[PDB]
Every structure is written in structure tokens, then in C-alpha cells.
Amino acid sequence: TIKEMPQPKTFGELKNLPLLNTDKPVQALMKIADELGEIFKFEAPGRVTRYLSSQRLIKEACDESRFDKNLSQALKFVRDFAGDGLFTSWTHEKNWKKAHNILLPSFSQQAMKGYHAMMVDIAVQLVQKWERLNADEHIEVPEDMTRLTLDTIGLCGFNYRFNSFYRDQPHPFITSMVRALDEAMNKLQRANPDDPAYDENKRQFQEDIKVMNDLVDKIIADRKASGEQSDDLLTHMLNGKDPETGEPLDDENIRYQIITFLIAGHETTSGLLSFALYFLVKNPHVLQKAAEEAARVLVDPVPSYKQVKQLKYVGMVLNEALRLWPTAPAFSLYAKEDTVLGGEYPLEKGDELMVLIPQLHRDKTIWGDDVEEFRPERFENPSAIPQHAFKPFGNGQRACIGQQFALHEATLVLGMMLKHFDFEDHTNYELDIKETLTLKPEGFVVKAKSKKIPL
Ligand code: HEM
Numbered sequence: 049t050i051k052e053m054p055q056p057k058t059f060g061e062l063k064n065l066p067l068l069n070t071d072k073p074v075q076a077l078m079k080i081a082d083e084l085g086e087i088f089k090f091e092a093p094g095r096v097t098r099y100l101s102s103q104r105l106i107k108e109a110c111d112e113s114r115f116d117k118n119l120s121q122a123l124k125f126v127r128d129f130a131g132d133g134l135f136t137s138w139t140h141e142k143n144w145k146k147a148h149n150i151l152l153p154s155f156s157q158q159a160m161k162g163y164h165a166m167m168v169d170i171a172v173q174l175v176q177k178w179e180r181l182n183a184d185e186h187i188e189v190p191e192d193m194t195r196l197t198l199d200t201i202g203l204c205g206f207n208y209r210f211n212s213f214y215r216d217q218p219h220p221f222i223t224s225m226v227r228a229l230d231e232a233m234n235k236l237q238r239a240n241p242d243d244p245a246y247d248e249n250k251r252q253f254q255e256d257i258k259v260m261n262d263l264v265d266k267i268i269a270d271r272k273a274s275g276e277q278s279d280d281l282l283t284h285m286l287n288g289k290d291p292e293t294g295e296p297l298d299d300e301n302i303r304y305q306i307i308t309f310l311i312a313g314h315e316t317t318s319g320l321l322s323f324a325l326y327f328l329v330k331n332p333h334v335l336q337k338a339a340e341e342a343a344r345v346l347v348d349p350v351p352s353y354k355q356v357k358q359l360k361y362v363g364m365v366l367n368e369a370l371r372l373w374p375t376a377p378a379f380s381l382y383a384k385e386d387t388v389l390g391g392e393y394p395l396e397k398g399d400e401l402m403v404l405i406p407q408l409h410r411d412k413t414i415w416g417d418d419v420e421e422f423r424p425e426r427f428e429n430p431s432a433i434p435q436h437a438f439k440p441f442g443n444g445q446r447a448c449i450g451q452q453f454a455l456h457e458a459t460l461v462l463g464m465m466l467k468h469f470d471f472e473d474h475t476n477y478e479l480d481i482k483e484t485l486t487l488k489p490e491g492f493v494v495k496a497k498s499k500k501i502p503l
Contacts, residue, residue: 101407
């Protein structure tokens with residue numbers, strides 16, 4: 049039948065906006081979902097969206113004939129620096145399909161064969177950092193995973209070394225990028241965005257956007273002048289042509305793609321590695337099984353591509369970490385035409401839906417009643433997973449283009465971590481999830497004990 053959907057508390061002309069005036073808005077939405085169910089209405093002044101938490105409704109939302117990717121307010125704000133790169137373009141914008149057609153083969157699993165040596169280069173730097181800590185010291189887990197993922201995308205992205213393991217003070221590029229992201233998210237909570245108060249905020253924003261462009265613009269410009277060819281995405285974008293239009297990407301869009309690769313993949317992949325290690329130390333039997341596979345499979349000083357492919361249980365560990373805490377926890381859709389969702393909720397052309405992925409992944413009609421448990425063996429048989437039940441990489445043609453890159457990196461790095469060290473949760477760490485663009489376990493720290501295996 050036609051059902052009216054619930055809606056959390058409203059505050060006059062501010063509507064539900066005050067409910068996200070928190071440092072952890074996604075986690076606050078998960079609680080509201082718990083309280084209200086599989087769908088609820090959320091309004092802000094001038095805006096409406098419907099938050100979806102059940103596989104039954106989300107599978108319909110994932111029907112591309114009915115729904116397409118929406119640029120949420122958050123993505124509209126990130127667009128001020130990511131431009132018409134793949135992540136912040138409408139599906140119907142010409143530069144979305146051109147960039148997509150040109151870059152997709154460069155992100156295939158086969159393409160990872162090509163990036164593997166550079167990924168191994170930064171992974172080795174991580175392991176050697178940890179090999180060199182003094183016995184009284186400890187590891188700052190999300191910080192080190194972020195040094196790793198940023199450096200890996202820079203090196204495979206455009207043959208540039210950020211050298212994050214050589215410095216605590218971030219590259220000025222990284223400083224401005226992180227700061228631009230913080231401002232874009234902070235903007236979502238402002239009722240009066242134009243108060244003079246936010247005036248220096250706007251100021252720093254344009255300075256940050258200039259730091260980013262001038263580095264990336266200069267890198268592209270130098271590469272074109274030198275004519276060098278490398279095993280990186282930038283070479284691909286300068287030589288590639290869209291078979292459909294027959295056109296290449298221009299230099300401005302290439303810059304937006306490179307800025308996009310840095311933002312969109314660095315924080316998500318580091319958060320995945322951080323959550324994976326969290327769950328492993330909280331579940332010592334799972335850690336043991338993973339480390340035994342790593343020891344069995346990674347028989348060389350240097351892992352090969354083929355060996356990484358053999359880390360099946362490590363892969364399951366990662367997918368289960370993605371199930372419980374998908375680090376890009378939500379994506380937005382719009383109805384292409386009038387349609388009725390689940391036989392109960394009529395939608396008009398243009399209406400926005402938000403997929404709350406952590407809630408989806410806790411649907412007990414799909415995963416059983418132990419959904420809060422960390423159990424990698426859930427992924428032992430992939431075919432047992434219903435379509436649209438597991439979506440940490442989004443949906444359809446607008447799904448993550450970096451998925452193979454992220455999982456190859458994370459599988460390699462976690463495999464090497466487990467090969468070379470035993471880990472201690474020395475502080476009995478209490479999970480604290482910080483929210484930016486993405487999710488990550490803030491203050492997560494461990495001590496490692498080297499297994500004394502050389503590289
Ligand atoms: C574990 C890590 C990652 C997670 C969970 C993840 C998640 C996602 C999700 C949820 C989407 C869809 C967003 C939407 O519908 O609005 C997406 C988009 C995208 N991701 Fe990732 N991402 C990850 C790693 C990467 C990496 C490593 C890169 C790049 C090197 C990357 C580049 C992109 C791009 C370019 C898009 C847009 C695709 C398009 O619309 O054409 N991501 N990602």
C-alpha cells in the first residue's frame with residue numbers, strides 16, 4: 049500500500065538540519081535509522097532526501113533504468129575544487145563519459161599488474177618504518193596508513209613522490225587538500241552561510257584551491273614539455289582518446305582527475321586498512337588465520353602480483369571490514385522519472401535518495417542476526433551474497449573506478465604487515481570513529497613485534 053514515511057524531529061524553518069550539527073553525522077543517521085526503520089525523510093531549508101537502509105529498498109534504488117547518481121550537497125561543495133572530474137560530474141555531462149571511457153582500462157584488475165611495483169615500493173617503506181621503531185614506541189595506525197595511500201596514489205597517479213615517510217609536516221598540497229575538504233563538509237551544517245564570520249573561511253578556501261591547482265597544473269605542464277612516458281595514469285590521460293567522441297581530455301580536466309584521485313581514494317583506502325587492523329587485533333583467532341595465510345603465500349622478500357591474488361582470507365578480512373564500516377558510507381541518487389519505491393513510497397522525477405551503506409550492511413534478513421560480529425567467513429562464498437546487499441564501492445556505472453586499485457593496495461599492504469610483525473592492542477583501544485569525507489578509527493594505536501623476516 050501507500051505508506052507515509054517517518055521523519056525525525058524538526059526545528060522550525062531549520063527543519064531537520066540541526067540533527068546533523070554534530071561531528072559524527074553519519075553515525076547519528078544510523079541511530080535515527082535504527083529508531084525509524086528502512087526509510088525516513090530528512091529535510092533542510094529548501095531540500096529533501098530519503099535515507100534508505102534496507103536491501104529490499106536499496107536494490108530498487110540501484111536499478112539504473114530508474115535512478116542515476118545525484119550530486120549531493122556535499123559533492124556540490126567538493127566540486128569547488130574537484131571540478132568535473134569523475135567523482136563530481138553528472139552522468140550526462142560530456143566530460144563524465146569521456147573520462148570514464150578513457151580511464152576504465154587503466155583501472156582494471158589487469159592494469160594492477162602495472163602498478164604493482166610502485167605499490168610494493170611504498171609498502172616496503174611502511175614495513176621498514178615499523179622495523180625501525182624502538183621497543184618503547186608505538187604506531188599511529190590511521191596516520192601511517194594515510195602516508196602510505198597518499199604516497200601510492202601520487203606515485204602511480206603521476207610519478208610524483210610525496211615522501212610522506214620522510215616527514216611529519218604534510219606536503220603543502222596535502223595541507224590545502226585536507227583543509228578544502230574540511231571546509232566543504234563544514235559548510236553542510238551552516239544555516240547562515242553568508243554571515244561575515246565565515247569570510248576568512250572563504251578566504252583560505254581559495255588559497256587552498258590555488259595550492260592544489262598550481263602543483264598539479266605544473267606537473268602536467270612539465271610532463272608535456274619533457275615528453276617522458278611512465279607507468280602512471282597521467283601518461284594514459286595525455287595519450288588517451290575517447291573512442292566515442294574521438295576526443296582526448298584537456299589539461300584542465302586532467303588536473304581535476306588527478307585532484308580527484310588524491311581526494312577520493314586516499315582517505316577511503318587508509319580508513320579500510322585502519323579498520324581491518326582494528327578488527328584483527330580485537331579478534332586474535334582471525335588475525336592468526338590471516339597471518340598464517342600471509343606466511344604460506346608470501347614466500348619471497350618481495351610479494352609478486354600473483355601472490356597478492358592468492359591472499360584469499362586477507363581479502364575476506366577486508367570485505368568484512370568494509371561490511372561493518374564502509375569508509376565512504378553514503379551515496380546519493382535521483383529518480384529519473386516518477387516511480388513508486390517498494391510498492392509503498394511514491395517518488396517524483398528529481399527526488400533524492402540517500403543509500404546509508406553501514407545500515408544496509410546490517411540488514412539481518414540478508415546477513416543473519418549476528419550482523420555486529422566480525423566474521424570474514426561470511427565472504428567465503430561470494431555467490432551466497434544477494435545482488436545489492438554489499439555496496440561499499442557504490443553502484444553500476446557510477447561505482448568506484450578505483451575499486452581494484454584500492455583492494456590490490458590494501459591486500460598487498462595488510463599481507464605484508466601480517467607477514468612481518470605480530471601486533472599488540474597495548475591500550476585496549478576504544479573505537480572512536482572520526483568523520484570527514486570518510487570514516488576512520490581516530491587515535492587507533494598498536495605496538496608491533498618484528499618477526500625478523502628480511503626484505
Ligand atoms: C576502499 C577504498 C574506496 C572506497 C570504499 C571507495 C568508495 C567509492 C564509492 C562509494 C564511490 C561512489 C560515490 C557516489 O556514488 O557518489 C566511489 C567513486 C569513485 N572512486 Fe572510490 N573508493 C575507494 C577507493 C578509490 C581509489 C583508490 C580511487 C582512485 C585512485 C577511487 C576513485 C574514485 C572515483 C574516480 C570515483 C567516481 C567514479 C565515477 O563516477 O566515474 N576510489 N568510490
